[PDB]
Amino acid sequence: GWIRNIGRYLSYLVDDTFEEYAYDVVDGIAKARTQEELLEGVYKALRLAPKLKKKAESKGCPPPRIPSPEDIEALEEKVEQLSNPKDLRKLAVSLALWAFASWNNCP
Amino acid sequence: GGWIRNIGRYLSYLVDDTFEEYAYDVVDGIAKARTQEELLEGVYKALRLAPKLKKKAESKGCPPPRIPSPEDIEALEEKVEQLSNPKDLRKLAVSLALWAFASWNNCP
Amino acid sequence: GWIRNIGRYLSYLVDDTFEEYAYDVVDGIAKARTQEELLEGVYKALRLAPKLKKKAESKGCPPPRIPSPEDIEALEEKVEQLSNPKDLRKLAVSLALWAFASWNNCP
Amino acid sequence: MYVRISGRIRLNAHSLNAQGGGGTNYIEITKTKVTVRTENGWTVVEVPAITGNMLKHWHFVGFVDYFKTTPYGVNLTERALRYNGTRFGQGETTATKANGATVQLNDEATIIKELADADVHGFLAPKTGRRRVSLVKASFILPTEDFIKEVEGERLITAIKHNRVDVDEKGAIGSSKEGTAQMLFSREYATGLYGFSIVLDLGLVGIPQGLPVKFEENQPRPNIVIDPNERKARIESALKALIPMLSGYIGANLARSFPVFKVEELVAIASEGPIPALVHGFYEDYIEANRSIIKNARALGFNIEVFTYNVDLGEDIEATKVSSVEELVANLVKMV
Amino acid sequence: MYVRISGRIRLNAHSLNAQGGGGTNYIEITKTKVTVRTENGWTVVEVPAITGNMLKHWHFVGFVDYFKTTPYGVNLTERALRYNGTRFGQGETTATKANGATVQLNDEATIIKELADADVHGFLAPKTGRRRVSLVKASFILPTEDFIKEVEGERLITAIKHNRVDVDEKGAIGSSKEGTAQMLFSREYATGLYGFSIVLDLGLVGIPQGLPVKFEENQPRPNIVIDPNERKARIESALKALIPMLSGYIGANLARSFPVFKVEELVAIASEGPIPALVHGFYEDYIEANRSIIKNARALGFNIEVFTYNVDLGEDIEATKVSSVEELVANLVKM
Amino acid sequence: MYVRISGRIRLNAHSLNAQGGGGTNYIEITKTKVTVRTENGWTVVEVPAITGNMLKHWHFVGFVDYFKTTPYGVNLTERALRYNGTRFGQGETTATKANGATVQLNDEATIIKELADADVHGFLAPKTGRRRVSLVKASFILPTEDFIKEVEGERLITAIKHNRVDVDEKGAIGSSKEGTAQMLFSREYATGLYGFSIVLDLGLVGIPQGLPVKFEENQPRPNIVIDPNERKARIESALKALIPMLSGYIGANLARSFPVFKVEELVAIASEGPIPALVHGFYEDYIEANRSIIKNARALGFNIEVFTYNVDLGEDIEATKVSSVEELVANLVKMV
């Protein structure tokens, strides 16, 4: 449900094979209480796409797959109705949990 | 509202590859829209680059970019006029700022 | 809507066809700081009206939509209550935002 | 003399009391949970904080600094001169003075008579079993509740990464196989409005815990084991340790961060007797609670003296309009 | 006299009453299991709770500290001045006062006449019995069930790590082979809105346990073996000992933690005769329980004075507004 | 002899301490979040800043530059002559002196005796465990609060693009296939009025931090492992290191940007004994706080000397007006 594709991209900011070690964005998306800071944190996570692309290309392993624009609008289309923070926390921590999986990228 | 995606598609052209126009500052300024004034200013700076992308896309064998229609501009003006609360303004700005980075298939 | 027509006229200064590119006047209108600067920018924008009117039929395009007197007057008395740049900058940016839209100037 | 201080401090761009080690990349700042309203039921949020151990250690540093210059500065542990807080660790029976003289950890009276740091800050001697509760107590430096409610969580945290330029003598930046250490490491810097509360129990200085009184004349005369001058000097040393405290010397990474301090407001109370603890500055309604506590304590028969900075308090009770922290400590030492 | 207090207090960043960790490098805060509804389900949660022994000891500390100021404060045990209080045992039949006077444990009357801690907090004399129960009792300190229901998830328990750096004679340091003291331990810090409840039966201070009344002249007068003046002094000291409890002076790790304390709400009832405790503050509906219990007690013919802080408790009941715990103590010391 | 300096400087067209980019054509200026009071309630704003680490590095550069000319200038590290700030990276137990001699790292006294950089700016050798806290404390350079009030952000930043022209012998730009390097990168330039604060605890130069005193006859005396002339030279060099810091030699990209760097105003204090730190120049109400601190500290008996540039500080405080930073350092070196 459009979580694996964004989850692996989020993991791309944590894997040891990519020596940039951006844990602040993962902490920010994980510790989200309402809509605005969650969207801001996911925007900061998604902003590092050129860095990851030009670092993977210079290394040799296949480039990371940025989330496709078809599942981008799903994020707001689902989170607009999440007024209650209790239900928001579910996905706010699920994304961070997916960001810490193995996700073998560069062989 | 349907115009957020329309303006995000245009904003994608300022960051995407095969265009050599790496305007990260304007996208970040739109994303960091504290007030409505500077949000509109950043949108204006992003729109000023329309002729450059429009000509370079056909100069490198790519479909012309989808510059937002005047209806989208009217909707944006209405939203800016009726939103005087930074609480909604921040998420409004982030909504169209997030679309800049994606796996858009601009050039087939 | 009293701003859409002025923006429609201003879009003639930059677009496909209408081979007369005037970015400096659009920037001066958009970057207006004082009321005098905005008025001078509007005057410079209106100065090119005969050029566009004659060039419209030189390429087969419909004649341009020159703003009526009434909205120009209304702009003149709308300018004379803004004592701070706060509102004037917003008015200038709103006026200049329509210039770079996907107008159907002449099908 | 017993004194309590509580207030707020503005503080931005501070990497104080981090978690990770120096050699580990991405040094992380400490986090702590707090409970707030958010216009509904109770909710817990995780915010950067400074532990009370850090504050207590920097109070110890300031006290040692201000007690060295006194004529009784010889009566100090050799570890104190090194700012070493390990007071009588596990597996030792004797300690070394500042001048090199040895002291035996058999009784508390001689320990507190000859060693000043172990007297103000307490000590533990597991090998012998001796004890002394610290006279100074400190709380956490938590961001104030109304500030947290007012910012809706922009994370108050910036992870700034930077590197050293360790290079070979020939001018080549080698890899890990060469021996160079040109690597990027990240430090987390916090910001916001914080609250602090530290209590001092300086009335028991120079008095052994076991035998507070001796009853020489059938009356409770305190068992002052040291000279009154030494006890007094220890008192103003502990009181003057607050001057470097509320100036920017209660944090780590001072060489590269040096936190940007400005005390916003505070209240201090002292009555040379038993005193209720003030309300921590973390709560948004601590001014009214402190005003009520002061008023009821004074009406009950306590000789509370109150100094307030940048708070109106009650405007009807006798409170001194102090202008800064060092003026406050000057007023405190004028009432010894 | 006979007083009962129950309420809710906010305290965070605290490690009061931990497991000590005398053999392990990790120190665990206290925990207990609690059952609560989960919208038609009896779920169980592990939440920190301060034991009543901690509160009893800290109230004793406050009482012995406030009893020294009074001129009648000589009548105290030598243990009391050191915040001791083991209070004899199977091998001791002699009490040493603050001045060092031998006191026999033959009867409770002399024990309560010559000692003040033994009078209020009880004692035990295995030699001849003479058991005296504590006049002040305290309950545990649990977060309210409303808080537990509303948090559901979340840990509110932080394991914060502290080091003990020990620089050597020049600048060196060692881990475990140089004999120095350089370790890295951890402490558990809790938060939440807790509930407290105490019962003080101060009406029996100075009266021997075995002889509540003398009944010699055909009147059941109280058997006060001590002078009324210092009996009143003991009452005042015990009532003032409440002040250095609801301020942050309860628990452990006071030097490094000093919990961020703020009393939220409370209800207290005071009377000259035997009265029942109202309800613990852990329950969500404890305010209505207090209202019902005070109405029922007043219906049976009881003279109760009720003080409320940050709670309405209805309008029919003549309750006294309380600005702070010290206002309550000042109103109480009127008797 | 301790010094505290604070004030405000105006920077234009500067790109000091950027984020480097690393492997991309965009280079961003470093950002940090600060808390601003505002009349509408507390807010957090992300603003460009210069980290205190680079400020410390440039002070180290100035100190080395002014100590090289000193006759005792041979007592430096070979890395210091190259402005290499790394202090005894992991795995090495020896230090190469400027003259080529080898210095062991088993003793701190020798290290501070024949290595001036480690003495002044501190060091750490993880292999042997020796350490020394730096004597210089540097804080972040942040735009002042009232400036943010007045400008309302305006993004305070431009992005200027510079080309990378690779014209070969034939005169062609290439097509990234032959080996040409014709590209187009961009750099971020900021502007505004910033505030700075610097602390120099020049009282432990040549004095090991383990045994600061000797106690010959229970009479405190500094434990100096070097002759007093070297101490005086090191202190003078450290003081003079401020000249190539307030002239515009702070930060990176000096060859292509060279910040405009006018010093707007400043206040400094200096005293032989320990003194509280001054208020950072970020806050709008920092002149009044510094004035109160100075007045009350002098009332407490601290023999402090105050030098003010473009700040009045009223009449009660006895301060000497100073024309520029050069005159300030001249006055500082006048009083040893």
Short mmCIF file of all heavy atoms in Angstrom, two decimals, chain F residues 265-299:
data_model
loop_
_atom_site.label_atom_id
_atom_site.label_comp_id
_atom_site.label_asym_id
_atom_site.label_seq_id
_atom_site.Cartn_x
_atom_site.Cartn_y
_atom_site.Cartn_z
N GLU F 265 29.63 47.31 16.57
CA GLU F 265 29.82 47.72 17.95
C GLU F 265 30.33 46.54 18.76
O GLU F 265 30.17 45.39 18.36
CB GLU F 265 28.52 48.27 18.56
CG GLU F 265 27.39 47.26 18.62
CD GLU F 265 26.07 47.88 19.00
OE1 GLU F 265 25.80 49.02 18.57
OE2 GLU F 265 25.29 47.23 19.74
N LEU F 266 30.94 46.84 19.91
CA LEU F 266 31.43 45.76 20.76
C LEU F 266 31.67 46.27 22.17
O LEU F 266 31.86 47.47 22.41
CB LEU F 266 32.71 45.14 20.19
CG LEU F 266 33.94 46.01 19.94
CD1 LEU F 266 34.81 46.14 21.18
CD2 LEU F 266 34.76 45.44 18.79
N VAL F 267 31.65 45.33 23.11
CA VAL F 267 32.03 45.57 24.49
C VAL F 267 32.85 44.37 24.97
O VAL F 267 32.52 43.22 24.68
CB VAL F 267 30.80 45.81 25.40
CG1 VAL F 267 29.92 44.58 25.48
CG2 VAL F 267 31.24 46.25 26.78
N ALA F 268 33.94 44.66 25.68
CA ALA F 268 34.83 43.62 26.18
C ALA F 268 35.19 43.93 27.62
O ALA F 268 35.28 45.09 28.03
CB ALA F 268 36.09 43.50 25.33
N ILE F 269 35.41 42.87 28.40
CA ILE F 269 35.87 42.98 29.77
C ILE F 269 37.08 42.08 29.95
O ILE F 269 37.23 41.07 29.25
CB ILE F 269 34.77 42.64 30.80
CG1 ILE F 269 34.32 41.19 30.64
CG2 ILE F 269 33.60 43.58 30.66
CD1 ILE F 269 33.25 40.78 31.62
N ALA F 270 37.96 42.46 30.87
CA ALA F 270 39.17 41.70 31.13
C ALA F 270 39.54 41.83 32.59
O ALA F 270 39.51 42.93 33.15
CB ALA F 270 40.32 42.18 30.24
N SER F 271 39.88 40.71 33.21
CA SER F 271 40.22 40.72 34.63
C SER F 271 41.15 39.56 34.96
O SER F 271 41.10 38.50 34.33
CB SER F 271 38.97 40.65 35.51
OG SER F 271 39.28 40.22 36.82
N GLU F 272 41.98 39.76 35.98
CA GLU F 272 42.93 38.73 36.37
C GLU F 272 42.24 37.51 36.97
O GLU F 272 42.66 36.38 36.72
CB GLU F 272 43.95 39.30 37.36
CG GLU F 272 45.05 38.32 37.75
CD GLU F 272 46.07 38.94 38.69
OE1 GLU F 272 45.90 40.12 39.06
OE2 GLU F 272 47.04 38.24 39.06
N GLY F 273 41.18 37.72 37.75
CA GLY F 273 40.47 36.64 38.38
C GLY F 273 39.34 36.11 37.52
O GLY F 273 39.12 36.56 36.39
N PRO F 274 38.59 35.14 38.04
CA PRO F 274 37.46 34.59 37.28
C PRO F 274 36.30 35.57 37.23
O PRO F 274 35.95 36.20 38.23
CB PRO F 274 37.08 33.32 38.06
CG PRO F 274 38.14 33.15 39.13
CD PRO F 274 38.74 34.49 39.36
N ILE F 275 35.70 35.69 36.05
CA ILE F 275 34.60 36.63 35.84
C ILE F 275 33.51 35.96 35.02
O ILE F 275 33.77 35.05 34.22
CB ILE F 275 35.06 37.92 35.12
CG1 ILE F 275 35.73 37.58 33.79
CG2 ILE F 275 36.00 38.72 36.01
CD1 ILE F 275 36.05 38.78 32.94
N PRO F 276 32.26 36.38 35.23
CA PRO F 276 31.17 35.83 34.42
C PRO F 276 31.28 36.25 32.96
O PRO F 276 31.81 37.31 32.63
CB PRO F 276 29.92 36.43 35.08
CG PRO F 276 30.40 37.66 35.76
CD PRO F 276 31.78 37.32 36.24
N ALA F 277 30.76 35.39 32.09
CA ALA F 277 30.78 35.68 30.66
C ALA F 277 29.80 36.80 30.32
O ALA F 277 28.78 36.99 30.98
CB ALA F 277 30.44 34.42 29.86
N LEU F 278 30.13 37.54 29.26
CA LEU F 278 29.27 38.61 28.80
C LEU F 278 28.07 38.05 28.04
O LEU F 278 28.04 36.88 27.64
CB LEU F 278 30.04 39.58 27.91
CG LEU F 278 30.98 40.57 28.60
CD1 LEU F 278 31.77 41.36 27.57
CD2 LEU F 278 30.20 41.50 29.50
N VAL F 279 27.07 38.90 27.85
CA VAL F 279 25.86 38.51 27.13
C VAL F 279 26.14 38.53 25.63
O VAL F 279 26.76 39.46 25.11
CB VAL F 279 24.69 39.45 27.49
CG1 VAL F 279 23.49 39.19 26.60
CG2 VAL F 279 24.31 39.27 28.95
N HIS F 280 25.69 37.49 24.94
CA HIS F 280 25.90 37.38 23.50
C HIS F 280 25.19 38.51 22.77
O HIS F 280 24.17 39.04 23.23
CB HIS F 280 25.40 36.03 23.00
CG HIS F 280 25.73 35.74 21.57
ND1 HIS F 280 26.99 35.91 21.05
CD2 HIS F 280 24.96 35.28 20.55
CE1 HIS F 280 26.99 35.58 19.77
NE2 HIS F 280 25.77 35.19 19.44
N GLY F 281 25.75 38.90 21.63
CA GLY F 281 25.22 40.01 20.85
C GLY F 281 24.00 39.70 20.02
O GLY F 281 23.49 40.60 19.34
N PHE F 282 23.53 38.46 20.04
CA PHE F 282 22.32 38.11 19.29
C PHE F 282 21.10 38.82 19.85
O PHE F 282 20.24 39.27 19.09
CB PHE F 282 22.13 36.59 19.32
CG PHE F 282 20.72 36.15 19.03
CD1 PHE F 282 20.25 36.11 17.74
CD2 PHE F 282 19.88 35.76 20.06
CE1 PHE F 282 18.96 35.70 17.47
CE2 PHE F 282 18.59 35.35 19.80
CZ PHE F 282 18.13 35.32 18.50
N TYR F 283 21.01 38.95 21.17
CA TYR F 283 19.82 39.52 21.79
C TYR F 283 19.79 41.03 21.61
O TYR F 283 20.82 41.71 21.65
CB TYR F 283 19.79 39.17 23.28
CG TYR F 283 19.82 37.69 23.53
CD1 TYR F 283 20.93 37.09 24.10
CD2 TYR F 283 18.74 36.88 23.19
CE1 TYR F 283 20.97 35.73 24.32
CE2 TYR F 283 18.77 35.52 23.42
CZ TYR F 283 19.89 34.95 23.98
OH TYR F 283 19.93 33.60 24.21
N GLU F 284 18.58 41.56 21.39
CA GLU F 284 18.43 43.00 21.19
C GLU F 284 18.76 43.77 22.46
O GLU F 284 19.42 44.82 22.40
CB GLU F 284 17.01 43.31 20.72
CG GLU F 284 15.93 42.52 21.43
CD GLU F 284 14.53 42.94 21.01
OE1 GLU F 284 14.35 44.12 20.66
OE2 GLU F 284 13.62 42.08 21.02
N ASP F 285 18.31 43.29 23.61
CA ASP F 285 18.56 43.95 24.89
C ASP F 285 19.79 43.35 25.58
O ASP F 285 19.71 42.77 26.65
CB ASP F 285 17.33 43.87 25.78
CG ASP F 285 16.15 44.65 25.22
OD1 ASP F 285 16.37 45.72 24.64
OD2 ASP F 285 15.00 44.18 25.38
N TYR F 286 20.94 43.51 24.93
CA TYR F 286 22.19 42.99 25.47
C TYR F 286 23.11 44.07 26.01
O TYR F 286 24.04 43.75 26.76
CB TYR F 286 22.93 42.16 24.41
CG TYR F 286 23.87 42.95 23.53
CD1 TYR F 286 25.25 42.87 23.71
CD2 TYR F 286 23.39 43.76 22.51
CE1 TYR F 286 26.12 43.58 22.90
CE2 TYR F 286 24.26 44.47 21.70
CZ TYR F 286 25.61 44.38 21.90
OH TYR F 286 26.48 45.09 21.10
N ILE F 287 22.89 45.33 25.64
CA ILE F 287 23.66 46.42 26.23
C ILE F 287 23.27 46.63 27.68
O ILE F 287 24.13 46.79 28.56
CB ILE F 287 23.49 47.71 25.40
CG1 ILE F 287 24.05 47.51 23.99
CG2 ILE F 287 24.19 48.87 26.08
CD1 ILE F 287 25.50 47.11 23.97
N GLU F 288 21.97 46.64 27.97
CA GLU F 288 21.51 46.84 29.34
C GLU F 288 21.93 45.69 30.25
O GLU F 288 22.36 45.91 31.39
CB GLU F 288 19.99 47.01 29.37
CG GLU F 288 19.48 48.17 28.53
CD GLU F 288 19.07 47.74 27.13
OE1 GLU F 288 19.95 47.30 26.36
OE2 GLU F 288 17.87 47.84 26.80
N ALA F 289 21.81 44.45 29.76
CA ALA F 289 22.21 43.30 30.56
C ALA F 289 23.71 43.32 30.85
O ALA F 289 24.13 43.06 31.98
CB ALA F 289 21.83 42.01 29.84
N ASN F 290 24.52 43.64 29.84
CA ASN F 290 25.96 43.74 30.06
C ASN F 290 26.30 44.86 31.03
O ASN F 290 27.19 44.71 31.88
CB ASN F 290 26.68 43.95 28.72
CG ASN F 290 26.82 42.66 27.93
OD1 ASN F 290 26.99 41.59 28.50
ND2 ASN F 290 26.75 42.77 26.61
N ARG F 291 25.61 46.00 30.91
CA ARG F 291 25.83 47.11 31.83
C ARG F 291 25.54 46.70 33.26
O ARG F 291 26.33 46.96 34.18
CB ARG F 291 24.96 48.30 31.42
CG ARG F 291 24.87 49.39 32.46
CD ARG F 291 23.82 50.43 32.08
NE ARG F 291 24.14 51.09 30.82
CZ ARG F 291 23.36 51.06 29.74
NH1 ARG F 291 22.20 50.43 29.75
NH2 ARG F 291 23.75 51.70 28.64
N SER F 292 24.39 46.06 33.48
CA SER F 292 24.02 45.62 34.83
C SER F 292 25.01 44.60 35.36
O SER F 292 25.41 44.66 36.53
CB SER F 292 22.60 45.06 34.82
OG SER F 292 21.65 46.07 34.58
N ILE F 293 25.42 43.65 34.51
CA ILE F 293 26.38 42.63 34.94
C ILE F 293 27.69 43.28 35.36
O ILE F 293 28.24 42.97 36.42
CB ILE F 293 26.59 41.59 33.82
CG1 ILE F 293 25.39 40.65 33.73
CG2 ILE F 293 27.87 40.80 34.06
CD1 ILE F 293 25.52 39.61 32.64
N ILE F 294 28.19 44.20 34.55
CA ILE F 294 29.46 44.86 34.85
C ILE F 294 29.36 45.64 36.15
O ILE F 294 30.23 45.54 37.03
CB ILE F 294 29.89 45.76 33.68
CG1 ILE F 294 30.40 44.91 32.51
CG2 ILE F 294 30.95 46.74 34.13
CD1 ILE F 294 30.55 45.69 31.23
N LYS F 295 28.29 46.42 36.30
CA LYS F 295 28.14 47.26 37.49
C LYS F 295 28.05 46.42 38.75
O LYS F 295 28.75 46.68 39.74
CB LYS F 295 26.91 48.15 37.34
CG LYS F 295 26.83 49.27 38.37
CD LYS F 295 25.49 49.97 38.30
CE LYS F 295 25.35 50.75 37.00
NZ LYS F 295 24.05 51.47 36.91
N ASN F 296 27.21 45.38 38.74
CA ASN F 296 27.03 44.58 39.94
C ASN F 296 28.26 43.72 40.24
O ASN F 296 28.60 43.51 41.41
CB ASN F 296 25.78 43.71 39.82
CG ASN F 296 24.52 44.53 39.67
OD1 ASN F 296 23.69 44.25 38.80
ND2 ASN F 296 24.37 45.54 40.51
N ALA F 297 28.95 43.23 39.21
CA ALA F 297 30.17 42.47 39.43
C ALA F 297 31.26 43.35 40.02
O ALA F 297 32.00 42.92 40.92
CB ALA F 297 30.64 41.84 38.12
N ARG F 298 31.38 44.59 39.54
CA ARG F 298 32.34 45.51 40.14
C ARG F 298 31.95 45.87 41.56
O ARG F 298 32.82 46.09 42.41
CB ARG F 298 32.48 46.76 39.28
CG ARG F 298 33.73 47.57 39.56
CD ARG F 298 33.85 48.73 38.59
NE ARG F 298 34.32 48.31 37.28
CZ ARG F 298 34.25 49.05 36.18
NH1 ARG F 298 33.71 50.26 36.20
NH2 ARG F 298 34.72 48.56 35.04
N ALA F 299 30.64 45.93 41.85
CA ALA F 299 30.19 46.13 43.22
C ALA F 299 30.57 44.95 44.11
O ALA F 299 30.89 45.14 45.29
CB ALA F 299 28.68 46.35 43.25
#
